[PDB]
Amino acid sequence: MGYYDIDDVLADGTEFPCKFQYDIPGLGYLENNPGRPITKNTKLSLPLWLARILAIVGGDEPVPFVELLPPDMFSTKVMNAIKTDPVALDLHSINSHFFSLAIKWIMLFSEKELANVVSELLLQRAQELNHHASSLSINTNIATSTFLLKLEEMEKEIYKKSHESYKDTKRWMFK
């Protein structure tokens, strides 16, 4: 949680499905005809940076104005996919802010069943990241590139840092 961090600011911008648990006249002006109010139980795709607050304010039965539905990224389908084989999964395709979004979602809703699986996922991916980082040139196969293009954005900085560390050590060793 850093105010001046670019990736967190970008990740706050993703849209999450949610429903109007409460009915408010005069709303929806910013999306549709302003004169027509929004009726109850209306599904919307609101950004995280406001959906996080509007679901906790209550306002007032001090129920919040909005009720947030389970997003499609966190689905039984994806859970099975990540559990069966994580090393070859193109998690980049599902979302490009997966890990920070997962942290925020698990922080909002404590769920012991996601922490362990996500931890195991990234732990298993770390070994292959190290494997590829150690390898250096001295004629190139498709496996390395097709792996590197599946990564999450937050793993790229670890990959680059490790690669630079190994390259610098090799350069110093051989002169």
């Binding site: 961090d5 670019i6 970008l10 911008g13 006249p25 005069g26 406001l50 509007l54 304010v57 306002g59």
Partner: protein, 204 residues
């Protein structure tokens, strides 16, 4: 509504990658104050709208729940706009200070970017103030040690130096070096690092 702000923030990320790939402060790009003032005028619109809505809320014909939800939505919009703008500005200031710290605080316009026109006026006066602080810092208790010197540990005393640009002759302590074009020197390491940073010497 603040999606436009993301367009700014995303752009900033690219600039950081420009820093990352190069690993050297150089050629800082042109600012984006146009989108910034677009956000400023839209946030002025938001502020005047919020003030008006508070006016009608105090007037008595406006629903309390509507007033409060409008107020929260507008406040969140302002918060995100401010966050985006300061996120851009902090990175700009950081890279500016990084650039200013290593060139001995003299801005070196004679020989990075040439025009420095890609920086706002406020940024340029901030750069001048930071150069002032950089000059001030080494003038106090640490006068014997140049804080803007090298950072590579001294590993050897005598190195070969090959000339890169032509000049006349330059004095040193107990001697004088004539910078004839394209010659080689066998000199002490701790004498020519200043020239090397200036770009007048090559082949360390």
């Amino acid at each position: 509504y603040g999606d436009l702000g993301n367009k700014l923030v995303l752009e900033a990320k690219r600039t950081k990658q420009l820093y990352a790939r190069s690993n050297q402060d150089v050629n800082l790009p042109m600012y984006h104050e146009d989108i910034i003032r677009n956000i400023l005028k839209e946030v002025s619109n938001l502020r005047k709208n919020t003030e008006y809505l508070k006016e009608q809320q105090q007037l008595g014909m406006l629903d309390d729940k509507v007033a409060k939800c409008q107020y929260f939505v507008t406040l969140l919009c302002m918060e995100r706009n401010k966050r985006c703008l300061l996120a851009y500005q902090r990175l700009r200031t950081d890279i500016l200070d990084s650039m200013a710290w290593n060139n001995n605080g003299l801005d070196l316009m004679s020989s990075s970017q040439q025009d420095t026109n890609n920086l706002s006026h406020q940024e340029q006066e901030y750069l001048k103030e930071y150069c002032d602080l950089i000059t001030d810092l080494k003038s106090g208790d640490l006068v014997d040690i140049d804080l803007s010197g090298s950072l590579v540990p001294p590993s050897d005393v005598f190195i070969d130096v090959r000339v890169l640009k032509d000049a006349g002759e330059i004095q040193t302590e107990y001697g004088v070096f004539n910078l004839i074009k394209d010659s080689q020197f066998f000199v002490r390491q701790s004498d020519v690092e200043r020239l090397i940073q200036q770009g007048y010497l090559q082949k360390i």
